[PDB]
Amino acid sequence: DYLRELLKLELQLIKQYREALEYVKLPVLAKILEDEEKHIEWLETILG
Amino acid sequence: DYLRELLKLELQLIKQYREALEYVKLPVLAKILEDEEKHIEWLETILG
Ligand SMILES: [Zn+2]
Ligand SMILES: [Zn+2]
């Protein structure tokens, strides 16, 4: 439930990052996207 | 300012993750900590 909360804020982050990359165009942001996505991949596994 | 908002939620996430690792003890969470920390390192550089 602590993992679910954690999972919500990585979903919120993924979204904002997604919109910044169409905005500004910065490779690094695209690096953090990748990272955020693997985190929800892993939290989602912990959760079933 | 979009980077600052992004930076706030990675600060919030870092904190919660930090408290989960003293709670549950899971290597993976310690992996996501590392990742979240490098992200604020990089956003902080973009910001000066
Ligand atoms: Zn993350
Ligand atoms: Zn992050």
Side-chain angles (χ1 to χ4, degrees):
Chain A
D1 11 55
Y2 49 106
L3 307 159
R4 268 177 290 274
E5 173 43 11
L6 277 163
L7 181 64
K8 176 135 49 285
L9 318 179
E10 292 260 55
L11 244 10
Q12 281 190 175
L13 215 30
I14 215 127
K15 237 249 292 193
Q16 270 210 65
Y17 274 127
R18 181 63 198 246
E19 270 303 316
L21 266 179
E22 303 262 17
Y23 164 39
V24 203
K25 293 139 109 72
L26 313 171
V28 59
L29 264 23
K31 258 253 267 224
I32 303 160
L33 244 162
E34 292 203 306
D35 269 21
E36 308 297 26
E37 284 177 353
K38 172 193 76 122
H39 302 166
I40 87 109
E41 243 136 62
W42 300 339
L43 301 153
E44 271 176 12
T45 283
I46 302 172
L47 252 2
Chain B
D1 11 55
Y2 49 106
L3 307 159
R4 268 177 290 274
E5 173 43 11
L6 277 163
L7 181 64
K8 176 135 49 285
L9 318 179
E10 292 260 55
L11 244 10
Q12 281 190 175
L13 215 30
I14 215 127
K15 237 249 292 193
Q16 270 210 65
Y17 274 127
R18 181 63 198 246
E19 270 303 316
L21 266 179
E22 303 262 17
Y23 164 39
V24 203
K25 293 139 109 72
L26 313 171
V28 59
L29 264 23
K31 258 253 267 224
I32 303 160
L33 244 162
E34 292 203 306
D35 269 21
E36 308 297 26
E37 284 177 353
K38 172 193 76 122
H39 302 166
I40 87 109
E41 243 136 62
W42 300 339
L43 301 153
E44 271 176 12
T45 283
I46 302 172
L47 252 2

